[PDB]
């Protein structure tokens, strides 16, 4: 019992060196403190550039009415299962099941402003416009009412 | 309160503004 | 790239810390919560009051007596250095995680500044990205902007204005010259001459020879502007 | 404690109604030239055209990039100058016009100034005041949230729109905290707790501000400058978080992207309602792309469709060449190395070559620079080999010189360490007879 | 490695010791072709286990050098 508790400690003892051996190249103290934004703060920070500069995300919230009147197309030919299997999170990928379960976890929590633009490319419903335009007679009708 | 009623005063100003040991560890 | 690697900046970080091995912890909680904390060295111990946001912290780290913390006043983040070689004994097999370390000596609370000597081309490209420290290894940073590198040129003039930042300049040896071409030399005739330019050694064996990229025969394979601006040994 | 190639050039060193001074601004002699960027300095301070060009056309070393220089320090910092060589252009992420194209827009600058009204205080009372109910129902109703602060040599207590309770919960400003509350805005941003209860817990992870000077009240007016690229770059950007754009935007590194038409259009759009507003004016910059000659007949094409463009900024060249083809040409040769058609959009400017006691001046001048004390028989013999083979081998044989003076424990320079440095470094021509 | 037998975790021997759950080592019994063993593991090699979704009678690999089990 006491040779095998000390190979056991030496063993301890090797482990724990190179554990605490490990050291970064640059500390993220250091990545801190080349990356700081010097002394600025929002006490003089420029409120006129919420508005002067727009993201792509606002760009796509605040420009709705053009992506509901103008997506027509649709896919001509798709296939379900590639969405899952190209991402690796089928039932029978090399992926673990815990490390898939967090990543479909991760995407349902995860929130997408470009969904409007899915959906609308997904299915070509057409909308109350068509009633006036599927009908030629209705057409007319409009116009001389 | 839906009744027309006044709240509580103190719970009225904490809304408009917004004991034991728990944990105890020692090194034997 | 290659002549921002030739010039180098050194940087000075002024860090406050406290480090020991907590002795006891006790938090009481109803209302807010209020716990005192004690925390030796291997020459002092002292009991601390915990404010709230600490005693998050300590929670949100799951620290427990016997275990050697680091704590920075300024900002009270709260890093688990190791734990004793006394609660070693404890276990047949060991978490990635854990570390044995030693009591540390002296006052519980220590100033200490560190120097830093960080490339012009290495700051560009950790402030370029989110992640410019990786492609620090990688080599995929690609074409940062020229407004990132006047901004760097702006922020490394009020460091060492300011005092905190040193510049140490050095040697650019370019081996085999003749096989760059007449752009190259004609970008390399005005950036010889920027304030942060470096000392360019050149070391060249072609004698009377065709500039790349021209249709006729140069000294040593060099336009004449560029030896103009240089000395020949 | 540097000594770069152009330290020297101070400013071009005219005066109000007149010409330029023989020695003044580090420049000496070449009058015309400094007359001409000074005429053409005033012209871009004048504000009021796009597209002008200037050629700066002379033989090596004729101070054509000292006076670019010049041109940018008399303008100043405050006006945007985008220094950019012509051998730049050719990128390998995107097309050459892509490049221009967003230095162009680099080169024009605005300047955005907002006065702004604040209180600023750490907190002290905080007390709703109840009010009638319009609408009755026996309920609390309170018609102004009440605030009082304190700062070094000021304290005042405030009425508020109730609205601000809505605030002060999100931000959870609490007694003692030191606040950031704008006048018009309704906003508040806290920022610190007070120095004063710093003492009242030995721990504590939050930062103790020192409590703000001056009366509570304070009027700040703040200036920015932006350029149009920045702007642009920033807008085509996403915001950069959590959400799965900003995922794919990490996963895929960031190149250079042909920005379209469109969101230039939206950009200037937004521009010019700003500026409408009176909050923001323009500042058009200068753009100088030295070794014009390395630019492709392609990118020469598309300078002169650029030029054209409705916001462009001054466009400051620099050739060393004579005639030679246009690269992207065959067999056009042309003077400098700009092609016709751009030279008939542009003007030239001469720069002359220098006398022997031009020589001495800009070496005297520049060993001054360099805090070097030179003879005035080692200064004639520097000023004849200067005239010998190279002024800038001179200028450049210069700091050896001081070494080898340094090296004797001699704070002069002597003909003896000028003679050692011609022996241990050979010259352009001495070394093409090798 | 080995067939673990019993797996029997156990908490702090006071509630105030710990945050949370509080769960204290875990128990571990391993069976080999020259005999068993009963090892007491960290709870951070508990959370591995319950991570790979081990139950009694499969066979297992434990790291030590890491911590990492299979
Ligand atoms: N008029 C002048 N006054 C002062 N220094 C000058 C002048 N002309 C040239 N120089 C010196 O020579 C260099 C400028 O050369 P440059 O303007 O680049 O000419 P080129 O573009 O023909 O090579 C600078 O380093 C400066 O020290
Ligand atoms: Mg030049």
Redesign the interface.
Known sequence: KLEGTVDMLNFLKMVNKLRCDRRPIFGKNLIDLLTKDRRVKYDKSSIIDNELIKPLQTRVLDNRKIIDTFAVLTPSAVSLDMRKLALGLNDDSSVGENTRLKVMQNCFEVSNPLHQLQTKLTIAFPDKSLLQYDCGKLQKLAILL | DFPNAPPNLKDFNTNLFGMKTVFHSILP | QAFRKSIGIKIKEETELIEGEVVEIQIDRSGHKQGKLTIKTTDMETIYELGNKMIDGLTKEKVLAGDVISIDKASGKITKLGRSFARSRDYDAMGADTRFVQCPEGELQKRKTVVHTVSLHEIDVINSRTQGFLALFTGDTGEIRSEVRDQINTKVAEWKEEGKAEIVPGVLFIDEVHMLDIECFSFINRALEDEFAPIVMMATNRGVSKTRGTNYKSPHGLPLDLLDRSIII | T?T????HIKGLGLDESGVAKRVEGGFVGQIEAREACGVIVDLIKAKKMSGRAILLAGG??TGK?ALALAISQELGPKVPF?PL????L????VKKTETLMENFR?AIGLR?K?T?EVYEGEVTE?T?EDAENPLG????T?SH?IVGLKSAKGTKTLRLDPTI?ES??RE?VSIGDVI?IEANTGAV?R?GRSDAYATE???????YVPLPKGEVHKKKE?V?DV?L???D????????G????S?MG?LL????TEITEKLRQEVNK??AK?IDQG??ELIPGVLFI??V??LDIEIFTYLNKALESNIAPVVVLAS?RGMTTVRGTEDVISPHGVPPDLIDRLLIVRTLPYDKDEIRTIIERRATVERLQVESSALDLLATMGTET?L??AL??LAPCGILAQTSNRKEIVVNDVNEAKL?????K???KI
């Open positions: 540097r770069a190639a152009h330290t090596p070393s990039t985008c060589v012509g051998s730049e050719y990128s390998v992420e680099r955005i907002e702004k905080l709703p129902g026996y309920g609390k309170i949230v309770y002060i919960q959870k950031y941003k920022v817990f030995d721990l504590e992870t939050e930062e703040i920015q350029t690229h920045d702007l770059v920033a807008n085509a950007r996403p915001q950069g959590q959400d799965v754009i995922m990490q590194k960031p190149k250079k937004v521009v700003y909050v923001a030295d070794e000659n390395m060393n190279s800038r081998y450049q044989l241990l470094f050979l010259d352009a001495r070394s093409t």
